[PDB]
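Hi again,

Forgot to attach this to my earlier email, sorry! This is the prediction with calcium ion bound. I've pasted everything inline since the attachment limit keeps bouncing my files.
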Amino acid sequence: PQKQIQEMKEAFSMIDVDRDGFVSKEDIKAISEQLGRAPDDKELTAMLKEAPGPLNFTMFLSIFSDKLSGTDSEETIRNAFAMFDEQETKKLNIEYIKDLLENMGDNFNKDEMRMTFKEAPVEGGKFDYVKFTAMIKGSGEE
Amino acid sequence: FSDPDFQYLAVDRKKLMKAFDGKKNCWVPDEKEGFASAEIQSSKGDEITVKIVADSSTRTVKKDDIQSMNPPKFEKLEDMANMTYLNEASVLYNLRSRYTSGLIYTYSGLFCIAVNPYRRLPIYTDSVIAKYRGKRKTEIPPHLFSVADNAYQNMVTDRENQSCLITGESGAGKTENTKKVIMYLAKVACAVKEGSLEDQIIQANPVLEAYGNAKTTRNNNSSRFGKFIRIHFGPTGKIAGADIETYLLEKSRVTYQQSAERNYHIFYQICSNAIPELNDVMLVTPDSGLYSFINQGCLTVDNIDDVEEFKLCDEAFDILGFTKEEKQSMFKCTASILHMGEMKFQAESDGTAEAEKVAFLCGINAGDLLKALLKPKVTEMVTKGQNMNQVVNSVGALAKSLYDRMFNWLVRRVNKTLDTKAKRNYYIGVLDIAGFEIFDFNSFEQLCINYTNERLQQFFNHHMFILEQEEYKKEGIAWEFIDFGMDLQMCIDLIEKPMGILSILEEECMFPKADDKSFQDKLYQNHMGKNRMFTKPGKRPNQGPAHFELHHYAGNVPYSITGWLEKNKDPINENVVALLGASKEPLVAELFKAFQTISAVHRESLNKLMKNLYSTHPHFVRCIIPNELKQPGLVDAELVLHQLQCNGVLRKGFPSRLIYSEFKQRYSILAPNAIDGKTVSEKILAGLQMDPAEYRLGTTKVFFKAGVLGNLEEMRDERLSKIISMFQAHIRGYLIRKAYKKLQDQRIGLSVIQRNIRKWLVLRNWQWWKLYSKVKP
Amino acid sequence: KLSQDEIDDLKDVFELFDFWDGRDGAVDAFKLGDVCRCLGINPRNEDVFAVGGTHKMGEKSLPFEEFLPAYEGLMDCEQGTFADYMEAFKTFDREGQGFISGAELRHVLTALGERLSDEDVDEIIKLTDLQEDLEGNVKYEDFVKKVMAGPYP
Ligand SMILES: Nc1ncnc2c1ncn2[C@@H]1O[C@H](COP(=O)(O)OP(=O)(O)O)[C@@H](O)[C@H]1O
Ligand SMILES: *[C@H](C[C@H](O)Nc1ccc(N2C(=O)C[C@@H](*)C2=O)cc1)C(=O)O
Ligand SMILES: [Ca+2]
Ligand SMILES: [Mg+2]
Ligand SMILES: [Mg+2]
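Structure tokens for the complex follow:
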């Protein structure tokens, strides 16, 4: 990931309000308390303990990278779906994947199944995994 | 063959007989024509779909009910034993084919079928006879004639006795071709008022037939009795003499007729007025429909002239040696019955005006008679009283007995006129007797006719098991696990041996109780529950009441013992007997001269008959009735088939066979490791672990013993269906394998898409990520 | 008896059919047999149910250790040999030339023995690429070779 870093940095700053070159405990409870519903205390505290030393930018992209280390690509994914599109229609009639995901593979649990379709792109019964993937991993917006 | 009148008489193939493939050509069942020729169109298991060749229509038919058709190579054959297929459908064919062309004979193998013409045919003429004389059954077309020759031929050169038993249904042809066989055998072996022995033998039919034959719906000239004429030949193969032997006259008809039937022909002709110069000799008034005893049913059989058949009758007497005396006597006694019938009478004598005619005819007195018929006698010796019935049926019995006692005189008398003592060496005795009849209601009348046949059905079977042994050795097998026949003696013993119902109804008639449970029980307590054949009645169509039930060869029959004692002895007023016994008439007196129940008399009549037949080399002629309507050249689909199933169509508990070829083409799927006609089959069994006694491997076919075959069929069907399953699991397992790599890849697919999403969620739930996004501008 | 690897081929496979209804360490009894075909067998339905098969998906679940024995079971059972099949089909070939009409074949497979959904038949007829002629008959010999031939020749 080269030019995603252009953003992290962007975020780092707009985040590092006091801009104490480091993201502080008060650095979050701020920028957050600025936009949406800010986290609690231990909430914050657990966010920092997630990083070895003070929060310089490096230590920042570091905690993020690990968090994206084992994701397959938009191909290994968008095609992992299409294996079930037999017809090459760019869609899995909903109920099919709904059942594929839940009562097969390693069975998807209830709430696990609920959040995954909360906003998933569904139409005339069909399901555009093509989009749902370009959403799950990557492309189109920001 | 060249040809004078072999024409519409024998084969006829240059002026008639001039596309076949046994794979689509076959016979299917037809409710109308019995069977029908058709072509096979499609297959679907037990649903072979075909087009009816004829009307070119379409229907489905079980692969089984279909029957192989014979190639046109065997049309109108003359020895259906040769046809490729001697099955039930094809036999109906080859006979109807011939029948419509007027050949009326056929040798399905060692038999001589004969569909009835119901039309006069020109094939018994002297010319035709001589064209048949001395000839081997093969150099000449089928025809009753040569059936008789081969007998004489064998009689002469094989020095033995020959018997031609003609058996069919009623109105088929029996009491017809029986005559031709005498008349022929006499055209060929001649020897040289009273006429010629030849003439007599022959002429002795219109008489016996005159008294013993009558109209039956089934047949105008039904023979109410059995007959067995022998014909002996001198040391030069010439007719040395003949002797008749009638069995079981139908006494009961003399006084009763079901509607649509007549009394014994004579009666009707006696009132024909053929010989007017006799009306007054018998006191008869030329009117049939006037005497209660003969006019109950129909009074005339279409195409049977009485006046003539009367004159011809009389003539016959002249030739048998009868005198004017004897002759006229016959008539008189016969005439009398008409009147015995008119004697009118609770009440006693109503007039005596007619009872007198009877008084005069039998040459005794009006008084004595008319008297004894109401106040007769008997260790104590008394006088008894008889009422309105104790007298009418007493008359009924009088007549019947007379007519009976008379008939026997007629035979006996005839056997005298041909008793010439020329030296006798072998004989050719034709036998014309009825057959196993099983009416809705059956009595002692029927138990007889049938019992008689039971013994005859053992003669045929004895003789058939004989050729059996002759098929068992040519295609060389000794296969003696004989064990059989018992079931036929079973009913036979239960019917004639000492302890059987046949000596009971005979000693239980000596015992002076003579009441119907005194017998309808004696049996029970002696055979009820103590037999396989004897059993309590069953439970069907429109049958009357029946007491014990017999297991006859043809099958189980219900019998009613009601009034058997009487039907068995002769319940005439012993009073009148002696009144008659002492008479001024040479006949009546003779007729009542100085054991014998109807059956210890049959016991011998029959024990005798057999002993004769079993001294002969038999010849069978199977007469078949074509239709009810009686028009010539027509075929009642079913009717025929029916008959063809009860004689010789080819059985009773013998081992079945199959050309080694067809055994392969049918039961190979049973023992599957093979790839030579006969060795293929030769293997299967061995591997099929076949018990070696269940079969023998003669050279043309394989002989199996019971359902060993059926066990195969059963095994086959079980197997055929397992393979089918096997081939299906193969289709089944093939698929599961085709769809196995998509099965594996997808598992990779549904792993990429769970894990990922099951991460992409965790990430949307990561405090940091949340933040990051809120900040995402 | 089986070889380790044979048990390995069962080990491999089993761990797929378990997966499909849920990795839970067991396999739906219904699929127990359907799983043996993935090992080059063709145990008739009567056989599979004879060892523990099931007719409806979701009645009994079977773990490996249990499975294996059930398999050795479905092995000793009879497999069809070309001849058998031929000598069976032959019992439907009247002309003798050896052609079994189309519809009949469909019949046999979908009417006799343990039957087939029209599908499979319609499928197995595509896969093996069976072809009826102008009159409408297929040589059973050719078809029988393919079914035994396997999907991957
Ligand atoms: N060969 C034949 N030629 C002409 N008519 C025949 C022939 N055979 C039978 N019939 C006809 O059928 C009737 C019944 O025949 P018959 O021989 O008396 O039968 P059965 O003795 O078998 O009870 C005859 O009266 C006759 O009309
Ligand atoms: C014809 C009856 C009929 O056609 N059916 C049978 C006749 C005879 C037999 N027998 C035997 O006679 C010997 C063994 C046996 O089974 C079976 C059926 C008729 O009405 O005369
Ligand atoms: Ca599972
Ligand atoms: Mg700061
Ligand atoms: Mg007759």
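Chain C has two domains: 3-79, 80-151. The first strand of chain C starts at residue 27 and ends at 28.

That should be everything now.

G.
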